[PDB]
Amino acid sequence: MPVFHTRTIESILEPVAQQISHLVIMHEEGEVDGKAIPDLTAPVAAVQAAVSNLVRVGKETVQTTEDQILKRDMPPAFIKVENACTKLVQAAQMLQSDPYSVPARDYLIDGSRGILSGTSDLLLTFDEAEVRKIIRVCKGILEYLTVAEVVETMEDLVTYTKNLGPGMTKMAKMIDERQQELTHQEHRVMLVNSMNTVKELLPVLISAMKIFVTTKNSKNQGIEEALKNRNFTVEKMSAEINEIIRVLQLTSWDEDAW
């Protein structure tokens, strides 16, 4: 079998791997031969009909995508399955010709088992490019967390906030979906806890900036205490987002690219 990385990859392939698992291991107990050649004229039609969709949408997803590791990885996988829609529609001519073929009804126990892997591989490719888009977003927030350091003005503050808040919303949104997709409880807890700690320091960051941006309008003011505070918050929020970023990297790390 293989390694199902998400709950949705598992959900799709799992059954048809639990299928070929029993539909394999039970064949020592004596399961006798039989067949249904006509109902194989169709199943291989839509099995070559959807192996035609995955390929199709897999072509818009290969051309419309800017990811480079995507193109250097996905189109190839169009091949893995291509032979599965071939060594099975082939098993079609080994269970039609000789309806007692011990090799034939075993070329479906491999052809299809190869139809999967082309799909298990197709999905990891795509899911891994998703994780890249998430990491890029978090790197975006890390950098913008940095300009907070250069906000001296009330309308600097208003611009900063106007811009930041929507990156936070985009990051939490993605960190939320992605976690709601992970199979290990420990990675999930990490993503969620860190994302929660950064949502909680956000308002604390902006607060201290406002006391900086306005206590800088009442001479003889306790300014430095506001900067110092500002800085700690960014140091904490940055540690956090880097924690997140790393756990995503650990989970989705490249094989045919660096």
Binding site: D33, P43, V47, N53, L54, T61, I109, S112, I115, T119
Partner: peptide
């Protein structure tokens, strides 16, 4: 709708390939 498109177009492939491994419980 589009980001799934690949998932749903490949959940199909898996199920029609499940109907095929069907006939082997004879």
């Amino acid at each position: 709708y589009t980001k799934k498109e690949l998932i749903e177009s490949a959940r199909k492939v898996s199920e029609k390939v499940s109907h095929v491994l069907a006939a082997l419980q004879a």
